[PDB]
Design a protein around this nucleic acid. Structure first.
Lengths: 124, 185, 37, 262
RNA sequence: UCCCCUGCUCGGCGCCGGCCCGAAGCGUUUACUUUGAAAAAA
RNA sequence: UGGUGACUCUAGAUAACCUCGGGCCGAUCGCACGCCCGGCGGCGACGACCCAUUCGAACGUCUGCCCUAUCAACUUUCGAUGGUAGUCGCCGUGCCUACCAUGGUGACCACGGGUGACGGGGAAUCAGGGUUCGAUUCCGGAGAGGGAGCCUGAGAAACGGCUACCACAUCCAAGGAAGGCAGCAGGCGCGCAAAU
RNA sequence: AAACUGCGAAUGGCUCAUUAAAUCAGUUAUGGUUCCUUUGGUCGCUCGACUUGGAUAACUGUGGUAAUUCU
């Protein structure tokens, strides 16, 4: 029974994207997850639910209102180019290297330790 | 260098005399009459009215037919009318000095709930505000120091998610109904 | 570009010098008029 | 220090850049360009905070690598390129042009212009230089070196250049009774008519400009800018037409607009 | 409340060498009084 | 020719110079391709002696600094003051050399000393006048134990660059080798006093 | 990958020890100098090969010192 309204809707031909501030109405219920929001934005924009990106949902005090942002693309690759990688990882389409910064910095100093082709060998 | 604010100020002032009878009795009477928590709240209201009176005296010091005096006088007069402690007939700058602290305590949310007729006593009004049962224009308030406006006095009502205003029954009612159904079946 | 653009500055400088010379001629003609009257 | 300064803090920025106060520690220092550090508008703050096209500082450099923004008709890939006063910003994709004219307050404001207005740009000459074998040169306020003008060009008068060829079409003589633009200081963005000019030898000269409603003010000679012959301009004015109305009249028109809107 | 009790080389609200007005240039210097410019942000 | 309130300004002509530890006058690269009888072309990147602009930096003008007389006179052929001619410096100039005259500041507090003194935008308190603090996030200055010297580079007397000293200090087959947390965490010492 | 080359490492960060017309603050000048980069100009203006030379990296192999981002 939740409803979605639009605000500050504007398009970017030079970014091939559409930007708007969405308003979420969920009275008597907890905060709706982003997947249902994405599927509803896919419904009212007549779009496949893969280029639909939403972020930043802050809940008001009292329940019933939650202000968020939505991002609407045209195609998959044009969405994949001009996107932050963490939203792609949230959608599951990107994977980053899993190592921590301390061993990277220590391994960089171990490449500093020697010279030559063995610089790649000492870092394993 | 970090990116913070570092801006804050006090909202209350401690009086110079700590122990004398008359002002202690007057503050204690005001605390009892309007159901407030401690002396810091009435000192805060006195501090705000003192700053407003100081600004009004500074505007009345400057001579007539000046742009900044008329601009700030009309701005402060419009704000003080719209907060609900003045009348449109008394639309003058020299009547700001005649105000008292009880007029500022009239527009508090606790006494407005008590005088509207949504609670029995003013302490019942305060423990109704702190309880999150009412709303002001489709949005609940929890703080008893919610100053209201002249156009916002009519729109105050019970919240949707409250058994007093129609909604889901509370914990104790559901516990007693569960106890009754356990004793019946 | 250097040759052609120098050619239009040659034409413009010649026209402006001619205009200044005839203006000075009118000025000394007015000087002779006020000296003769 | 031991060399040139390279970073820039948030509150060290000029007020007309006019950002917030808590989103970071550093502000975008512009790259070196035709304008000064203080009175300029970078591309990053314009695209991020005026047209609201992009939200984040990587998106604007993605735009600049996508080659969609042109300043004075040439594609600029610099993200902190200083686009100052009297500049034309052309976007080839969406098809709109922007010209930076100061409004009634001391800040830059957007001004959507026609493409037929977007092929020219005004300049103010700083000094007249004679070249090697007697070449008359130009020193404009936008660092454009022009060779061989009309010989009537003086120190103070303004010129019109064509963006494609970089040559003078027509010029406006600096005389008493021409339309005025003020750039810098307190009086910034007021449209008036130049009335009196006084010479102070050994110091800065001061002019006196009378507005259309009868208001008069004085500015220095170095901060003057002529935009029109007589009272007829050569560009399109922004909203308000450069009056600097008082805050009481602004309050009156704001409350009238709010009462009419409801 | 407001107009009046500063003088000799060039030129435009206007006329038939004559009237007036306006200007590249000048008039004992100080303090003080009033206005205007510039005087970073927080 | 041109401009400034002001040139020994820019420009014009003449007679030479033009430094081999030496000014310029493209022995570079990518993409898409071509027309016309081997020659002839587009859109860029990198570099370049100069010229202006931009980020500056640097040296100067006028005015404004806490306490102290149990500090009343101070500086000077070991430059203090000025002149002239120069060295050097990126330029002005005792910045420094050679020669001259005896100058320059002060009872309107110079000079000397102290500071539990970084300066300022500021903060507390506040009828009006005032008193105290400002190590502290923004600006400017100074230093990386303390003085001294230097390379590279446009810009450093740089210290997460080098070199000499002393104080301190690591490893060591005793021959030598390697350093500066007033950066982020953390340890010792210190102290009423300050975090992963 | 490694390595030669050009660039940036003189920015940022911390502290207040020295310093009392010194620093700094407002107002000025460089018509008494320098200026990486960016922007714009100049780049057949001069009257006399359809592409030149030999060295070095990286690499291979042989080594020393107890030890260094040593060679």
């Amino acid at each position: 029974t939740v409803t979605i309204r639009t605000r500050k809707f504007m398009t970017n031909r030079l970014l091939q994207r559409k930007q708007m501030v969405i308003d979420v109405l969920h009275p008597g219920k907890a905060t709706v997850p982003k997947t249902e929001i994405r599927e509803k934005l896919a419904k009212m924009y007549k779009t496949t639910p893969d280029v639909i990106f939403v972020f930043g949902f802050r809940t008001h005090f009292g329940g019933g209102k939650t202000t968020g942002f939505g991002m609407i693309y045209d195609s998959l690759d044009y969405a994949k180019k001009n996107e932050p990688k963490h939203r792609l990882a949230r959608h599951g389409l990107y994977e980053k290297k899993k190592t921590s910064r301390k061993q990277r910095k220590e391994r960089k100093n171990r490449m500093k330790k020697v010279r030559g082709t063995a610089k790649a060998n000492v870092g394993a | 260098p970090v990116a913070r604010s570092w801006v804050c100020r006090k909202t209350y002032v401690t009086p110079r005399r700590p122990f004398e009878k008359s002002r202690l009795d007057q503050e204690l009477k005001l605390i009892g009459e309007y159901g407030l928590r401690n002396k810091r709240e009435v000192w805060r209201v006195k501090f705000t009215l003192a700053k407003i009176r100081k600004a009004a005296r500074e505007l009345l010091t400057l001579d007539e037919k000046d742009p900044r005096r008329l601009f700030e006088g009309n701005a402060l007069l419009r704000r003080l009318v719209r907060i609900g402690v003045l009348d449109e007939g008394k639309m003058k700058l020299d009547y700001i000095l005649g105000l008292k602290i009880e007029d500022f305590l009239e527009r508090r949310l606790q006494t407005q709930v008590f005088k509207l007729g949504l609670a029995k006593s003013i302490h019942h009004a305060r423990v109704l505000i702190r309880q999150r049962h009412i709303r002001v224009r489709k949005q609940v308030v929890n703080i008893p120091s919610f100053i209201v406006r002249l156009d916002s006095q009519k729109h105050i009502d019970f919240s949707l998610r409250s058994p007093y205003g129609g909604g889901r029954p509370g914990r104790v009612k559901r516990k007693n109904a569960k106890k009754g159904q356990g004793g019946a079946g | 570009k250097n040759k052609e653009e120098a050619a239009e500055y040659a034409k413009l400088l010649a026209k402006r010098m001619k205009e200044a010379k005839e203006k000075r001629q009118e000025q000394i003609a007015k000087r002779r008029r006020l000296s003769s009257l | 220090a031991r060399g040139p300064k390279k970073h820039l803090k948030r509150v060290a920025a000029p007020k007309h850049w006019m950002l917030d106060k808590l989103t970071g520690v550093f502000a975008p220092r512009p790259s070196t360009g035709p304008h000064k550090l203080r009175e300029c508008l970078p591309l990053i703050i314009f695209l991020r905070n005026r047209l609201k096209y992009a939200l984040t500082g990587d998106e604007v450099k993605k735009i600049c690598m996508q080659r969609f923004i042109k300043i004075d008709g040439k594609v600029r890939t610099d993200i902190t390129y200083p686009a100052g006063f009297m500049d034309v910003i052309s976007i080839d994709k969406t098809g709109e042009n922007f010209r930076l004219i100061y409004d009634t307050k001391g800040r830059f404001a957007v001004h959507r212009i026609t493409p037929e207005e977007a092929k020219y740009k005004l300049c103010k000459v700083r000094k007249i230089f004679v070249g090697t074998k007697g070449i008359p040169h130009l020193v404009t306020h936008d660092a454009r070196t022009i060779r061989y003008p009309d010989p009537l060009i003086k120190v103070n008068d303004t010129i019109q250049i064509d963006l494609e060829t970089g040559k003078i079409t027509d010029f406006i003589k600096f005389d008493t009774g021409n339309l005025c633009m003020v750039t810098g200081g307190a009086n910034l963005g007021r449209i008036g008519v130049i009335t009196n000019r006084e010479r102070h030898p050994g110091s800065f000269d001061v002019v006196h400009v009378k507005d259309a409603n009868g208001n008069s003010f004085a500015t220095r000679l170095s901060n003057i800018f002529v935009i029109g012959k007589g009272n007829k301009p050569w560009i399109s004015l922004p909203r308000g037409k450069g009056i600097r109305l008082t805050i009481a009249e602004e309050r009156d028109k704001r409350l009238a607009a709010k009462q009419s809107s409801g």
